[PDB]
Design an enzyme around this catalytic site. Structure first.
Site, PDB file in Angstrom:
ATOM      1  N   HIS A   1     -10.387  31.273  33.657  1.00  0.00           N
ATOM      2  CA  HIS A   1      -9.750  30.207  34.436  1.00  0.00           C
ATOM      3  C   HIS A   1     -10.787  29.242  34.957  1.00  0.00           C
ATOM      4  O   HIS A   1     -11.933  29.606  35.261  1.00  0.00           O
ATOM      5  CB  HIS A   1      -8.944  30.767  35.617  1.00  0.00           C
ATOM      6  CG  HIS A   1      -7.894  31.748  35.252  1.00  0.00           C
ATOM      7  ND1 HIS A   1      -7.185  32.405  36.230  1.00  0.00           N
ATOM      8  CD2 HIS A   1      -7.374  32.176  34.060  1.00  0.00           C
ATOM      9  CE1 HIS A   1      -6.287  33.211  35.674  1.00  0.00           C
ATOM     10  NE2 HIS A   1      -6.428  33.127  34.375  1.00  0.00           N
TER      11      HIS A   1
ATOM     12  N   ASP B   1      -5.682  27.794  38.967  1.00  0.00           N
ATOM     13  CA  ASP B   1      -4.537  28.646  39.212  1.00  0.00           C
ATOM     14  C   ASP B   1      -3.280  27.912  39.627  1.00  0.00           C
ATOM     15  O   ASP B   1      -3.089  27.597  40.810  1.00  0.00           O
ATOM     16  CB  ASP B   1      -4.929  29.626  40.371  1.00  0.00           C
ATOM     17  CG  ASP B   1      -5.960  30.640  39.897  1.00  0.00           C
ATOM     18  OD1 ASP B   1      -6.070  30.797  38.666  1.00  0.00           O
ATOM     19  OD2 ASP B   1      -6.615  31.280  40.736  1.00  0.00           O
TER      20      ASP B   1
HETATM   21 CU   LIG Z   1      -4.543  31.723  32.210  1.00  0.00          CU
HETATM   22 ZN   LIG Z   2      -7.249  32.322  38.191  1.00  0.00          ZN
END
Ligand SMILES: [Cu+2]
Ligand SMILES: [Zn+2]
Ligand SMILES: [Cu+2]
Ligand SMILES: [Zn+2]
Lengths: 151, 151
Positions: A61, A81
């Site tokens: 991420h 996120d």
């Molecule tokens: Cu992901």
């Molecule tokens: Zn994340």
């Protein structure tokens, strides 16, 4: 850039089109994803815009501030996120997210990075295990695309 | 940032992977394209990273200085004008370019834009018709991909 777009594709049936628009100090993310199993699916910006090995080469991420994984409303979260999208019984998820951390310009720019929709729900870093703190236990990458500049 | 990558795909057999690396004050472009007919094929950065309608939604050549189309060594060219790539009898084109107008950051950044390989040779703006001054008469877009950030 003030607007961007991403077309999500994978090896399965999941596909979708995501649009991004800068508004004030936020980014508005809209679009739809089809071919999903009903329920929640993790939805994040991954670090690299590299599709040489499908969605696997997108990396982890996007996390320029070196934080742990969280949900979008948490203080402790990765910039990438974006929580979960929810598919209905016909496999369609309507995306409608407003986020203040992602950006289309400067340091936190996501242009040239990859959007990924995952197999399972994102547990938002509250899963109780170590994987929850890294990925949210969202599992497989069903589809992804590189975020490009739009008109 | 300092390195970028693009995976070219289309509706036919043409495929390829192009790498971009900022070296010193310039950008080095390398890689290979397969499935092409023997000969020269126009190779350009198009303005938008939008593949919602395949390569058609990438728009025209990236041209922030509002000039007419030309060859890479010309004063009068679009920033996206990278000339021709040449495929051998086996359909393979090796890309090895250094360009002084594209960049990976700032106003001339190509991150989030689209690389396109065309059906016909680019005439470098010297064909003598209006179309030469826009596209080099390079014709249809055989494959394209959005340029993303690489590790
Ligand atoms: Cu992901
Ligand atoms: Zn994340
Ligand atoms: Cu072109
Ligand atoms: Zn041009």
């Amino acid at each position: 850039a003030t607007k961007a777009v991403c077309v999500l594709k994978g090896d399965g049936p999941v596909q979708g089109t995501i649009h991004f628009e800068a508004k004030g100090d936020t980014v508005v993310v809209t679009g739809s994803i089809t071919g999903l199993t009903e329920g929640d699916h993790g939805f994040h910006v991954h670090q690299f815009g590299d599709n040489t090995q499908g969605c696997t080469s997108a990396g982890p991420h996007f996390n320029p501030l070196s934080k742990k994984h969280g949900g979008p409303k948490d203080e402790e979260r990765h910039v990438g996120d974006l929580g979960n999208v929810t598919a209905d019984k016909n496999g369609v998820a309507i995306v409608d997210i407003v986020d203040p951390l992602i950006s289309l310009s400067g340091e936190y720019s996501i242009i040239g990075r990859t959007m990924v929709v995952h197999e399972k729900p994102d547990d938002l870093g509250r899963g109780g295990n170590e994987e929850s703190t890294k990925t949210g236990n969202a599992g497989s990458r069903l589809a992804c695309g590189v975020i490009g500049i739009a008109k």
